[PDB]
Amino acid sequence: DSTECSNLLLQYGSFCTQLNRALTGIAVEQDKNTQEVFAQVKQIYKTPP
Amino acid sequence: DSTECSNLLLQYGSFCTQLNRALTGIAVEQDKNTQEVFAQVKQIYKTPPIKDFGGFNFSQILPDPSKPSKRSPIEDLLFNKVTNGLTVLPPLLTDEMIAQYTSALLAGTITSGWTFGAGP
Amino acid sequence: QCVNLTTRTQLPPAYTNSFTRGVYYPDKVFRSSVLHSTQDLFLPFFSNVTWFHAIHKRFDNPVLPFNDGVYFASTEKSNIIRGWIFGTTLDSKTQSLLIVNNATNVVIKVCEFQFCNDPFLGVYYMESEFRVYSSANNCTFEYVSQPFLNFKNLREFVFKNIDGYFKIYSKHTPINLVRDLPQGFSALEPLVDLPIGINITRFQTLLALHRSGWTAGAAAYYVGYLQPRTFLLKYNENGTITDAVDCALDPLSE
Amino acid sequence: SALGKLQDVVNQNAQALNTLVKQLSSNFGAISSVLNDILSRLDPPEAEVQIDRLITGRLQSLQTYVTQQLIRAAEIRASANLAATKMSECVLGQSKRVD
Amino acid sequence: QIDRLITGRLQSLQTYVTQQLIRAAEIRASANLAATKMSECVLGQSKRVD
Amino acid sequence: TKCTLKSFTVEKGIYQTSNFRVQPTESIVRFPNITNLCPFGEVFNATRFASVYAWNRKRISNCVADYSVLYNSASFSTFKCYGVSPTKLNDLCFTNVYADSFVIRGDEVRQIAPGQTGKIADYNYKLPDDFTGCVIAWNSNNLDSKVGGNYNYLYRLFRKSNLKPFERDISTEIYQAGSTPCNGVEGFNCYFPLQSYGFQPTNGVGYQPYRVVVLSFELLHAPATVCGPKKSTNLVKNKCVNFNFNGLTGTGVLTESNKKFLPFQQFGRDIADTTDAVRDPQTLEILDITPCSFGGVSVITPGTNTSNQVAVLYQGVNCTEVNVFQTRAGCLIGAEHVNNSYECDIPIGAGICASYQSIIA
Amino acid sequence: DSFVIRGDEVRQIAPGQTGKIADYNYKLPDDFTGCVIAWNSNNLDSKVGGNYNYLYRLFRKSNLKPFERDISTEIYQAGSTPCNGVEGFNCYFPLQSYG
Ligand SMILES: *[C@@H]1O[C@H](CO)[C@@H](O[C@@H]2O[C@H](CO)[C@@H](O)[C@H](O)[C@H]2NC(C)=O)[C@H](O)[C@H]1NC(C)=O
Ligand SMILES: *[C@@H]1O[C@H](CO)[C@@H](O[C@@H]2O[C@H](CO)[C@@H](O)[C@H](O)[C@H]2NC(C)=O)[C@H](O)[C@H]1NC(C)=O
Ligand SMILES: *[C@@H]1O[C@H](CO)[C@@H](O)[C@H](O)[C@H]1NC(C)=O
Ligand SMILES: *[C@@H]1O[C@H](CO)[C@@H](O)[C@H](O)[C@H]1NC(C)=O
Ligand SMILES: *[C@@H]1O[C@H](CO)[C@@H](O)[C@H](O)[C@H]1NC(C)=O
Ligand SMILES: *[C@@H]1O[C@H](CO)[C@@H](O)[C@H](O)[C@H]1NC(C)=O
Ligand SMILES: *[C@@H]1O[C@H](CO)[C@@H](O)[C@H](O)[C@H]1NC(C)=O
Ligand SMILES: *[C@@H]1O[C@H](CO)[C@@H](O)[C@H](O)[C@H]1NC(C)=O
Ligand SMILES: *[C@@H]1O[C@H](CO)[C@@H](O)[C@H](O)[C@H]1NC(C)=O
C-alpha cells in the first residue's frame, strides 16, 4: 500500500501490465482447457431408469 | 548511436548475441512450420479445363482466373478479413506460392483421390 | 481609487453540471487518428461547477481559492468580463498577477499591487472608469499581447501553475443558448505560457459596470476545479481532439 | 469473429512489439529516458551510472520480450504441427479418427 | 532502498510468471491430449495402438 | 562470417554477420528567430551614467542576451569574471541579470572585486565573497571629463559601518569624525560624506574616469528567462542527418510532410510515441522524419570446401542506398539473377533462393 | 607523480572530479587504480616574502587527457583577436604562480 513504492515502480514502465496480462491469459486458458476436454456434447443425455 | 552506451553495454558480454540467435531460431522456425504445413506435395497438380465433376461444384474453392492473385473466392475473403533496431523479415513462401500449394493440393484431392498422397 | 458597491442583492451561489467540458491539449504534440491516455490536471466530467451571475441587482466578484488549477467558463455578451486577479494575499505584502483586457489590448503584469476590496472597470453610455488598484510598487514581468476576446459568446479558460509556469488555455465557441452551459465537446487550445515563478492561491474575476448609480450588464460565468486524473483523448485524422473518456467517472469509461 | 484465431496472433505480436517500443520511454529510475540528455547534462562518471540504469532496464525489457516470443513460438509450433497432421490425415486421406 | 527491493521483487515475479507460462503450456498440451482421447476413445472406437 | 561463427570452416547457408548503418552525414540544428534582444545598448552606451553611491541597477530579464558582442568589444579595459567563464556566457542560462552601472576613478577599478577592501568597496559598492557574474570597466576620458573639471560624479567617503553586498546608501547624513555632538551642523570634525572627483583631461592614467558595469547572475527557482544566443544553421533535406529542433534531438531523414499541423503543435507522434513529424522553428513548415535505412548484413555462401565465393544481403535496404539485384528481402550483391526456377538451396526470402553452380539467385 | 598544490585543491586529485588543476594541470582517469598521498608542506614550500616557484596552468584551450603533461609556454588567445605570441588585451600567460 506504499504510494512512494508505486511512484518508483511507475518509472519501470508496463512490466506489471505485462505480468497481469500473462496471468489473465493463463487463467482463461485453464477454463478453455476444461471447456475443450469435457464439453464435447451439447445434449445432456440420461440413462434409462 | 551512443558510443558510450555501447562501451558500457560491452561489459555485459554476449547477451545481445543470445537474443539475436533466439530470434533467428524463431524466424527460421516459422519458415519451417510453413514448409511442413503446405509443402506436402512435390508435384504441382492442375484441374482439367472442363469442370465436369458429376454435378459437384468447386468454384468457391478453386482459384479464380479473373483475380490477379490467383486465389479462391474463399481465400480472397479470408485475406480481406484479416487486417529502433526493429526489422521484419519477409516469409520465405509468399502468399502466391502458398495459394499455389493449396491449389495443387485441391487439384490432387479432386482429380486423384488419396492416391497422390501415397504415390503417383 | 476604490469604491464600495453597496447596492448588491444577497443571493446564494448557484451550481450546475460540467458535462464534458474543460478538456485541453496536454502538450504541444500533434497526434493523428490515435487514442492517447494521459495523466494530468483535468476537469472531471459531469462535475459540480460553481455558477455566478451578473444581472440587474447581482454583481458576483468574490475571491476564491485557486487550488491546483481553475476552469473558467463564460457565457458572455457585450464583453462584461475583462480580466482576472491572481495572488496569495492580494495586497502589497506579496506579489500578484494582473490580467486585464481594456478597450485596446491585453496587459499581463506580475507586480506588488494594492488591490481594492471591490475592483472593477466601467463603460459610460465609452470606457472611462478604471478602479482595480491604488498602487504599483515592484514590477518583475510585463507582457502586452493581442486581445483574447441572449448570450452569444462562450469563453473557456484553463489556468495552471506548474513548475513556475502559468499555462492559459482558451477556446471561443459560438453558442445561442439562453441560460445554462451547452452540452458538447470542445478541446481548449494552449494560448500562452507565462514565466511567472510565483505562488498563487486565490483569484478574483474582474467585471465592468454600465453607467448612464451603476448597472451590471448581463453575463454569467462558471468556476470549476482541476483534479489530477487520467483522460483517454481521441485524435482524428486532422489532429483535433474530438472526444474524451474520463477513466475515473464510471466503470464503463474505466 | 470467424477468423479470431489468426487475428489474436497478429494482435499479440503487434502488441508485444508496441510494448517493446514503449519500454524505451521509461527512465527505470534514471533522470531521463533519453541518452542524449544524460550525456549532455552530466559528466561521464554519473552519466555512466544513469546510462547503466537505462541499459539494465532496456536489457530486462528485451529479455522479457524474447522469452515471451519463445513461449509463443512454441505454441505456434504446436499449432503448426497439428495443422500439418490435419493436412496429412484429412486432406491427403480419409481419417477414421473421431472429431 | 525501495529501488533495491523493487528490482528484487520484480525479478522474482518475472521468474514466477515465466515458470507459470511454461507449466501452463505443458498443461495445455496435456489438455489437448485429453481432449483427443475424449474424442477418439470415448466418442468412438480407435484403431490406434496403445 | 568466419569471425562471427568462431570457426575457420563455414557450412553452406546464409549467416547474419553484421548490421548495415546509414552513417549520419551532417548535423542540422534549427532554432527559432533570435528576437527580443536584451537592452544592453542603453546600459553600456547610455547618455549619462550614474554616480557610485547611487549606482543604476538595470534588471535584464525575459530576453536573450548576446554576450559575444560584449566580450569581443575592444573598448573595455577590464573584463573580469568571478563566478563564471567568459567563453561559456553564451551557453549558460540564468533567471535574471542585475546590471550595476557607475563611474569611478582609474585607481579604484580594482576595488570592485570579492574580498577587496577600499573606500568604494566599503562605502560605495560592495560585492559578496561568493559573487557570480562579470565586472566590465572602460576608460571614458573623452566623454565624461571636462577642462573645467567634472564635479558631477560624487562618491561616499565616510560611513560608520561597512556595506553589505548589493546595498545602496544615498543618505546625506553628516559624518562624525570625532566624538563631538553634531546635529547636522558642520564643524571642525564633522564633514559631508559625498565628495566630488577631480576628473580633468590633464590627469594621467589612474585619475581618469572609468565607467564600470557589473553583471550579476541569479539562479533561483524561477525559470531561466535569460539565455545565450542560438546559432541556427541551414536546413538540409532528404539526407540522414542529426537534427536538433528546439531541444528535441535525433537522427533521421527530413522530408517534406503533407500533415497539416494546428498552429499550437510542434512535434508529431505515431501510435508507438516516436517523433515522426516536426515543425521547423525558423520557417513554419512540417517535416517528416523517416528513420535512416538500418539493415542486417547477411552473408550467403556455399561450403568453404566447395568455394570461397560469397554474396551479401542487405535486409530491407534499397540497392541505391548502399551483380547487384533488388529483392523484396533487400539488396543482394554478388549473385547473378537468372530467369530459371530451381529448388531452394540457400533461402534468401520473399521467394528468392540462392545456389552455387558462381552464386545465382 | 609528484607535485605541489593548494590546500583546497587536494580534493581535485581524484577520478571523476571537476576542477581547475584537474582539467588543465593533472587529470586522473575514471578507471584509475592507485593511491593519492597529500601532506602539508608549509614549513618547507613557503617563504615569508612569497614562494613563487610553483606554477599552475590558468589558461588552456581544452581539458587534458589522463596522465597528460603540458609544459608548452605558448601564449593563450582568450578573445577573438589573435595575440601573435605577444601579451596584451585578452592575451595572458598560461602559467601563474602561487603566492
Ligand atoms: C458453380 O457455382 C458457381 C457459384 O456458386 C456458379 O456461378 C454462378 O452462376 C450463375 C448463373 O450462371 C450466376 O448468376 C452467379 O452470379 C454465379 N456465381 C458466381 C459467384 O459467379 C456456377 O454456375 C456453378 N456451376 C458451374 C458448372 O460452374
Ligand atoms: C470597501 O470596503 C472594505 C471592507 O470594509 C474596506 O476595507 C477596510 O478599510 C478600512 C479602512 O480603514 C480598514 O481599516 C480595513 O482593514 C479594511 N478591511 C480589510 C479587510 O482590509 C475598504 O476600505 C472600502 N473602500 C473604501 C474606498 O473605503
Ligand atoms: C452541487 O453542490 C451543491 C452544494 O455545494 C449541492 O446542493 C448540489 O446538489 C450539488 N449538485 C450536484 C449535481 O450534486
Ligand atoms: C489599456 O491599458 C494599457 C496599459 O496600461 C494602456 O497603455 C492603454 O492606453 C489602455 N487603453 C485604454 C483605452 O485605456
Ligand atoms: C518593493 O517596494 C518597496 C516600496 O516601494 C521597496 O522599499 C522595496 O525595496 C522593494 N523591493 C524590491 C525587491 O524591489
Ligand atoms: C503559497 O501560499 C500559501 C498560502 O499563502 C502557503 O500556505 C504556501 O506555503 C505557499 N507556498 C510557497 C512555496 O510559498
Ligand atoms: C479533416 O479535414 C478535411 C479537409 O482537409 C475535411 O475534408 C475533413 O472533413 C476533416 N475531417 C474531420 C474529422 O474533421
Ligand atoms: C554601445 O554599446 C552597445 C552595447 O550593447 C553596442 O551594441 C553599440 O554598438 C555601442 N555603440 C557604438 C557606437 O559602438
Ligand atoms: C523568422 O525568420 C525567418 C527568416 O527567413 C522569416 O522568414 C520569418 O518570417 C521569421 N518569423 C517567424 C515567425 O518565423
Side-chain angles (χ1 to χ4, degrees):
Chain A
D1 57 323
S2 163
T3 185
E4 298 91 3
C5 186
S6 49
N7 288 344
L8 292 174
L9 184 54
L10 286 177
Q11 311 299 321
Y12 291 104
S14 63
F15 278 132
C16 282
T17 308
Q18 280 205 76
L19 301 169
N20 294 354
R21 184 185 301 126
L23 289 183
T24 303
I26 293 175
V28 305
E29 189 157 65
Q30 301 323 295
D31 288 327
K32 185 190 190 338
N33 285 346
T34 310
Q35 173 81 237
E36 281 210 25
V37 166
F38 290 104
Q40 296 208 5
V41 286
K42 62 183 180 295
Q43 307 257 324
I44 303 302
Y45 299 111
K46 294 294 182 181
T47 58
Chain B
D1 54 326
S2 165
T3 184
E4 297 91 3
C5 186
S6 49
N7 287 344
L8 292 177
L9 184 54
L10 284 177
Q11 309 297 140
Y12 291 108
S14 66
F15 276 139
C16 284
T17 307
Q18 294 298 109
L19 301 163
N20 294 356
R21 187 180 294 129
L23 289 181
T24 302
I26 293 175
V28 304
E29 188 157 66
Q30 302 322 294
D31 290 329
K32 186 190 191 332
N33 285 346
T34 311
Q35 180 78 30
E36 293 294 329
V37 166
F38 290 103
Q40 296 209 5
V41 285
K42 298 289 95 176
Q43 311 282 304
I44 303 302
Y45 302 115
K46 292 190 296 292
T47 58
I50 304 302
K51 305 290 185 291
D52 183 23
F53 301 116
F56 289 86
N57 195 315
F58 306 107
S59 62
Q60 303 319 107
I61 61 176
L62 282 180
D64 204 334
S66 73
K67 304 297 185 186
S69 63
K70 300 296 185 292
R71 270 192 298 267
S72 85
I74 284 169
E75 282 175 327
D76 207 291
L77 196 148
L78 292 168
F79 271 74
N80 286 129
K81 283 209 76 65
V82 169
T83 56
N84 288 338
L86 295 173
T87 43
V88 169
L89 305 173
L92 179 55
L93 288 171
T94 63
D95 297 326
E96 292 85 1
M97 283 183 288
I98 297 166
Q100 184 158 233
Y101 268 131
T102 60
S103 78
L105 292 159
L106 282 154
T109 191
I110 281 162
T111 61
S112 76
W114 58 79
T115 66
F116 80 107
Chain C
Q1 293 182 335
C2 305
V3 161
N4 303 116
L5 300 180
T6 62
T7 61
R8 270 188 199 89
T9 300
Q10 284 72 240
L11 192 68
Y15 287 92
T16 182
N17 220 26
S18 172
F19 289 115
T20 60
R21 305 214 86 83
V23 298
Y24 58 94
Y25 287 82
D27 61 357
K28 301 291 184 66
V29 176
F30 172 84
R31 281 176 189 94
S32 86
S33 72
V34 73
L35 277 75
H36 189 255
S37 181
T38 187
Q39 180 67 41
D40 208 0
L41 274 298
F42 280 118
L43 179 74
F45 280 174
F46 295 99
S47 70
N48 212 13
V49 293
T50 312
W51 186 9
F52 287 162
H53 296 84
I55 197 67
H56 191 183
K57 199 132 180 194
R58 293 297 297 162
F59 196 78
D60 290 333
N61 265 13
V63 183
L64 307 169
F66 193 82
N67 297 337
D68 291 339
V70 160
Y71 164 74
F72 188 89
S74 177
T75 55
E76 188 61 47
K77 54 153 183 165
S78 62
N79 307 296
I80 308 301
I81 297 175
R82 307 302 292 162
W84 315 274
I85 289 300
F86 289 142
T88 45
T89 68
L90 303 192
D91 61 358
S92 59
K93 284 160 198 69
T94 62
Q95 193 173 185
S96 297
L97 166 62
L98 180 64
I99 313 298
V100 289
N101 183 21
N102 62 0
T104 56
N105 51 309
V106 295
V107 177
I108 294 93
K109 287 189 315 184
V110 176
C111 299
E112 293 179 317
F113 266 59
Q114 186 61 42
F115 289 154
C116 294
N117 182 76
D118 215 324
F120 42 80
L121 300 181
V123 175
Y124 198 93
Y125 262 97
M126 284 71 75
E127 189 145 284
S128 292
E129 186 175 2
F130 294 158
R131 285 189 174 95
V132 293
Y133 53 90
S134 55
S135 79
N137 281 353
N138 303 330
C139 291
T140 51
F141 177 28
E142 181 181 359
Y143 181 76
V144 160
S145 187
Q146 298 269 21
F148 294 153
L149 318 176
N150 195 3
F151 292 140
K152 281 300 203 64
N153 303 290
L154 182 62
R155 279 82 177 269
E156 287 97 352
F157 292 88
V158 177
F159 307 114
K160 297 200 296 186
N161 287 318
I162 302 297
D163 305 306
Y165 291 164
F166 188 56
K167 267 80 69 176
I168 307 189
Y169 304 85
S170 187
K171 174 57 70 176
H172 209 181
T173 299
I175 62 168
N176 210 34
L177 199 149
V178 184
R179 186 175 173 86
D180 210 0
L181 279 169
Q183 186 178 13
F185 199 90
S186 65
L188 269 75
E189 297 167 72
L191 263 294
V192 56
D193 195 0
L194 278 299
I196 56 156
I198 61 170
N199 190 2
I200 288 162
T201 55
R202 288 162 67 193
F203 65 99
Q204 172 168 35
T205 319
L206 288 179
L207 290 172
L209 301 181
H210 272 217
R211 303 269 193 174
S212 65
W214 57 274
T215 316
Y221 66 97
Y222 310 85
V223 172
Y225 293 99
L226 279 296
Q227 282 146 52
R229 57 184 61 247
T230 314
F231 277 176
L232 176 65
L233 304 168
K234 159 174 303 165
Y235 289 80
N236 65 336
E237 183 65 26
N238 294 317
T240 184
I241 298 176
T242 60
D243 212 18
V245 159
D246 190 8
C247 310
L249 172 71
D250 46 348
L252 181 56
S253 311
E254 198 149 331
Chain D
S1 59
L3 285 177
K5 296 186 66 40
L6 313 175
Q7 194 65 65
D8 278 322
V9 178
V10 171
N11 286 357
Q12 281 168 12
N13 286 308
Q15 182 178 5
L17 279 177
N18 286 338
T19 301
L20 188 71
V21 170
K22 292 286 181 68
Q23 281 297 99
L24 288 177
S25 73
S26 289
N27 47 41
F28 305 108
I31 63 170
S32 186
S33 60
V34 183
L35 291 173
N36 285 343
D37 291 335
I38 291 165
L39 284 162
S40 62
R41 279 166 58 176
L42 290 182
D43 60 353
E46 278 73 48
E48 165 157 355
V49 178
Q50 306 301 305
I51 285 164
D52 175 69
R53 296 291 298 273
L54 274 182
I55 282 175
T56 185
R58 289 165 179 190
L59 186 85
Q60 170 161 24
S61 303
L62 199 48
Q63 287 272 21
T64 295
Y65 165 76
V66 166
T67 297
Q68 61 91 31
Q69 275 299 320
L70 281 163
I71 295 163
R72 197 169 297 121
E75 170 157 40
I76 290 301
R77 181 187 59 247
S79 183
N81 285 343
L82 180 60
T85 311
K86 301 239 176 181
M87 185 65 73
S88 299
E89 290 181 33
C90 314
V91 174
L92 266 64
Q94 184 178 29
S95 185
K96 283 291 215 313
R97 297 172 60 195
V98 176
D99 302 330
Chain E
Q1 305 302 306
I2 314 174
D3 182 274
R4 299 274 281 166
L5 276 181
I6 280 178
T7 185
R9 290 167 181 191
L10 185 85
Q11 193 185 339
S12 304
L13 195 49
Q14 260 171 6
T15 293
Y16 164 75
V17 166
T18 299
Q19 296 302 109
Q20 280 300 138
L21 281 163
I22 296 163
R23 290 176 181 174
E26 185 164 33
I27 291 300
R28 182 186 59 247
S30 183
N32 287 344
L33 179 60
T36 310
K37 301 240 178 184
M38 188 72 75
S39 298
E40 292 182 33
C41 314
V42 175
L43 265 64
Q45 183 176 29
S46 183
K47 283 292 213 313
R48 298 172 62 196
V49 175
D50 301 331
Chain F
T1 315
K2 292 170 175 176
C3 177
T4 305
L5 290 167
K6 300 298 292 294
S7 180
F8 270 61
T9 58
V10 180
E11 183 66 25
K12 177 180 65 169
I14 174 169
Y15 299 88
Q16 187 273 331
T17 61
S18 178
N19 278 315
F20 170 71
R21 169 70 50 96
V22 184
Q23 322 288 335
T25 324
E26 294 91 6
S27 161
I28 300 305
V29 177
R30 301 288 278 167
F31 277 162
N33 292 352
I34 312 294
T35 54
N36 200 9
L37 268 296
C38 300
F40 287 143
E42 72 190 24
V43 180
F44 286 78
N45 263 325
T47 295
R48 274 184 290 101
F49 271 47
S51 43
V52 70
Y53 73 98
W55 44 270
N56 281 357
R57 167 159 272 197
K58 193 84 187 83
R59 190 174 69 203
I60 302 298
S61 60
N62 203 34
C63 57
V64 61
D66 204 341
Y67 300 100
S68 285
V69 172
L70 265 57
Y71 186 64
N72 292 346
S73 185
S75 308
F76 302 139
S77 309
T78 290
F79 201 110
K80 278 184 172 66
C81 306
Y82 291 98
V84 286
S85 171
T87 195
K88 294 308 195 180
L89 288 173
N90 304 119
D91 289 355
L92 293 158
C93 286
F94 307 102
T95 70
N96 57 70
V97 174
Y98 295 109
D100 311 336
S101 61
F102 47 88
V103 181
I104 43 167
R105 204 164 66 82
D107 288 340
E108 285 146 22
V109 176
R110 53 100 176 172
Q111 294 189 17
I112 314 298
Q116 188 52 263
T117 292
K119 292 301 178 79
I120 306 301
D122 295 341
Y123 305 136
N124 296 265
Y125 183 78
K126 179 70 185 187
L127 286 183
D129 297 2
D130 54 339
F131 178 56
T132 183
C134 303
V135 171
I136 309 162
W138 68 97
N139 201 308
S140 66
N141 191 44
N142 49 2
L143 297 175
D144 289 319
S145 307
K146 190 183 179 72
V147 65
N150 195 359
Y151 298 118
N152 293 299
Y153 293 119
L154 310 183
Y155 79 106
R156 181 170 300 279
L157 190 56
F158 300 117
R159 192 176 172 174
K160 298 296 204 303
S161 59
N162 293 25
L163 279 175
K164 277 186 288 275
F166 304 119
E167 182 169 31
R168 265 180 287 104
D169 192 10
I170 61 170
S171 314
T172 60
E173 179 181 2
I174 302 298
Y175 188 77
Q176 293 179 356
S179 81
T180 61
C182 285
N183 292 317
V185 168
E186 294 191 7
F188 290 101
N189 50 307
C190 275
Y191 320 117
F192 195 87
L194 310 185
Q195 300 288 311
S196 57
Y197 282 115
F199 298 142
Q200 285 155 65
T202 51
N203 289 337
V205 181
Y207 276 84
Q208 284 175 14
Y210 270 65
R211 285 175 186 207
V212 185
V213 180
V214 179
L215 306 175
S216 178
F217 302 143
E218 187 173 359
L219 200 63
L220 214 72
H221 54 84
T225 61
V226 184
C227 282
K230 295 305 157 200
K231 192 174 302 297
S232 162
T233 188
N234 297 347
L235 178 75
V236 177
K237 288 176 283 193
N238 278 292
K239 287 177 72 176
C240 172
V241 302
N242 296 295
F243 63 94
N244 199 324
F245 294 164
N246 293 348
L248 194 138
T249 183
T251 307
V253 175
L254 314 172
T255 58
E256 60 94 19
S257 177
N258 51 1
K259 312 179 178 191
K260 294 181 291 292
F261 278 20
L262 271 82
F264 64 94
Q265 277 155 328
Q266 196 84 5
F267 322 110
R269 289 182 193 280
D270 61 336
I271 296 96
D273 291 331
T274 64
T275 76
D276 56 336
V278 66
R279 174 181 286 173
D280 196 289
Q282 287 281 320
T283 55
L284 302 170
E285 55 175 16
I286 312 301
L287 306 172
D288 279 326
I289 307 176
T290 315
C292 301
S293 298
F294 58 87
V297 168
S298 287
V299 178
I300 295 91
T301 179
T304 67
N305 178 224
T306 293
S307 176
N308 289 7
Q309 298 186 261
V310 296
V312 185
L313 182 64
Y314 300 92
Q315 292 153 197
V317 169
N318 202 319
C319 282
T320 77
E321 274 92 337
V322 60
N323 277 3
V324 173
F325 179 47
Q326 178 68 61
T327 65
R328 255 187 275 141
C331 192
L332 179 54
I333 308 192
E336 167 72 41
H337 178 235
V338 295
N339 300 301
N340 313 83
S341 281
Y342 310 101
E343 293 294 325
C344 195
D345 189 22
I346 305 164
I348 309 303
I352 308 298
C353 295
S355 187
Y356 191 66
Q357 63 97 29
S358 61
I359 293 169
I360 58 161
Chain G
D1 312 333
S2 62
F3 44 87
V4 173
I5 58 171
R6 277 169 58 154
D8 56 0
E9 294 168 342
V10 302
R11 63 159 198 81
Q12 295 178 33
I13 315 295
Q17 281 295 323
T18 51
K20 187 64 180 296
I21 61 170
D23 294 348
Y24 304 142
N25 294 265
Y26 185 79
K27 179 75 180 78
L28 284 179
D30 297 342
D31 53 349
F32 170 65
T33 186
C35 304
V36 294
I37 324 298
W39 75 95
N40 200 310
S41 66
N42 196 46
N43 58 337
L44 297 175
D45 290 326
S46 196
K47 290 189 294 179
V48 60
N51 180 29
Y52 293 99
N53 292 359
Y54 295 113
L55 278 79
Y56 70 101
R57 186 171 297 277
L58 183 70
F59 277 162
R60 207 183 177 257
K61 298 195 301 179
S62 65
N63 300 354
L64 291 174
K65 272 77 69 178
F67 311 141
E68 179 68 27
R69 187 190 292 105
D70 199 351
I71 64 177
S72 191
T73 62
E74 300 311 305
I75 207 65
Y76 175 64
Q77 180 197 347
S80 54
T81 301
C83 295
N84 315 318
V86 174
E87 294 205 32
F89 290 129
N90 299 279
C91 297
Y92 295 97
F93 205 81
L95 313 176
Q96 275 74 13
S97 53
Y98 295 108

